[PDB]
Design a protein around this ligand. Structure first.
Ligand SMILES: O=c1ccn([C@H]2C[C@H](O)[C@@H](COP(=O)(O)O)O2)c(=O)[nH]1
Ligand SMILES: O=c1ccn([C@H]2C[C@H](O)[C@@H](COP(=O)(O)O)O2)c(=O)[nH]1
Lengths: 290, 290
């Protein structure tokens, strides 16, 4: 009999357990050991300000926060994010990595037609991360916002960052590939499709992003938040992290933190770091990954 | 719970049953009644030639067969399906329907940059349903096959029909939005994302086509079939059919039929109707009109 304070996070821990029990022992792109299950789905409750930030292992909240605003802005420049102290895109963006992919012409932090570009200018001809793109390409995020307001029962509210044409000039293919929105009884829900997922690091970071993104759009559209559906393709754990994930599994999860917005917004482009408060984020002791 | 000859189809009946018991009552695009659950996932074994053609309610197999071959060819002309007596796109590729969308310029069978165009020529400038697009756009299906053949551990094997640039010219926005492939120990698995699915008609149809597609790609790549993962956004059942479904839910599923290819194929473009054999498709009797 399993009664849990945070049922949703417990179900996540069960996902990790299930991967380790039933998962196939394949290899990585780098030749590293991986344990994988193909095709997984879990749901997280957002109903009263709740954001799915895992309490059994600390998630880089400030990384989630600054990156999402940096996504929404349509920005493809790595430096703007590093100004905010977030170094999550640093390795991919800087000189050495670019020259390895053959981007010798490219600037110091130019990431290519990555995420935010596609989100807000799909189909637009990309040149660099400084050229103004407004007016060019499809602004999906605007379209998604419009659909929610005018056609609440639409089964077509989709935002996709997967652009076959722009994959070549991309530094890193979209891991979070697309998402669909769903209005039910004044509540806004979101389903994320993530083609690849590390349960130790990547997945909990994407939960927090698309959880946050939902909350934001919910406010912009004057709706309450509903449910985050997290769907994975390759759900996996690294072979070296198995000891580390076993420590996480024995922990009883605390309640999720809550999102609070201090002011009001004109649109989705009106959000700033200082206005997204995170309340009561309690965590378990750190997990050594070395 | 209990043992079943066809554990896979039973689980589908359980999905329909879950939608009925837990699903929210909402309105359709044309003011009809649906009962809906947002975010659902199911798996279907394809090993040893098994194709998930449901047995508790006969699936229009010839439709599946002819439409998929038609997708692969890159074709987007509806008259080509009409010639094979498959009338599933008839109502959509129709003068009045096209004029209603403002496609007054259009030919009668011209459906726009729908599935087949995006699969073989993503990003190409669409003209009409008769032009030759060889060389233009990204050939995703070919890329997917190349990836499977030489990069079988890849987590980037995606083929998407969702093109925000082309949606406006589409007679209907893609329903099976995208799919991801996955190779494990010589076994090819596939995950399909459906943004909306009628459990009574569309879903069982989409199961068969992507089931079949996986079998084809496997043969082309010299691999064996694995699993089909079917992820749904708006999984729903129409209020009109609610009685017929309860009759279907009482039926014990028979064994899924087997797919048998009767000759070798040079590529994915080498598949003809006469060569795809379907063995032992035993169904339950028809249900009184839905
Ligand atoms: O948003 C992200 C970005 C990266 N990863 C991790 C998971 C995989 O280990 C790896 C993906 O690399 P590819 O398989 O896409 O090459 O990075 C995520 O889980 N989520
Ligand atoms: O491949 C398909 C095509 C159509 N539909 C059905 C299910 C929905 O009832 C409807 C789609 O509604 P819209 O997404 O067009 O609103 O068509 C499917 O399930 N699968």
């Amino acid at each position: 009999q399993q009664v849990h304070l945070n049922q949703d996070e417990y179900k996540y821990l069960k996902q990790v357990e299930q991967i380790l029990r039933e998962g196939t022992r394949r290899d990585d792109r780098t030749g590293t050991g991986t344990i994988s299950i193909f095709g997984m789905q879990s749901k997280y409750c957002l109903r009263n300000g709740t954001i799915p930030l895992l309490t059994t292992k600390r998630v880089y909240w400030k990384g989630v926060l600054e990156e999402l605003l940096w996504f929404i802005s349509g920005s493809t420049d790595g430096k703007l994010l590093m100004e905010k102290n977030v170094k999550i895109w640093e390795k991919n963006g800087d000189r050495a990595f670019l020259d390895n992919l053959g981007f010798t012409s490219r600037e110091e932090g130019d990431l290519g037609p990555v995420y935010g570009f596609q989100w807000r200018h799909f189909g637009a001809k990309y040149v660099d991360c400084h050229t103004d793109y407004s007016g060019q390409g499809v602004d999906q995020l605007a379209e998604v916002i419009r659909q929610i307001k005018e056609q609440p029962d639409s089964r077509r509210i989709i935002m996709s960052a997967w652009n076959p044409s722009d994959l070549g000039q991309m530094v890193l293919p979209p891991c979070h590939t697309m998402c669909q929105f769903y209005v039910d009884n004044g509540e806004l829900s979101c389903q994320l499709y993530q083609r690849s997922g590390d349960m130790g690091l990547g997945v909990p970071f994407n939960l927090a992003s698309y959880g946050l993104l939902t909350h934001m759009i919910a406010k912009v559209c004057g709706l309450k938040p509903g449910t985050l559906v997290h769907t994975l393709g390759d759900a996996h754990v690294y072979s070296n992290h198995v000891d580390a994930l076993k420590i996480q599994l024995d922990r009883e999860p605390y309640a999720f933190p809550k999102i609070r917005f201090t002011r009001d917004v004109a649109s989705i482009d009106d959000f700033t770091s200082d206005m997204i408060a995170l309340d009561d984020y309690k965590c378990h002791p750190k997990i050594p990954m070395d």
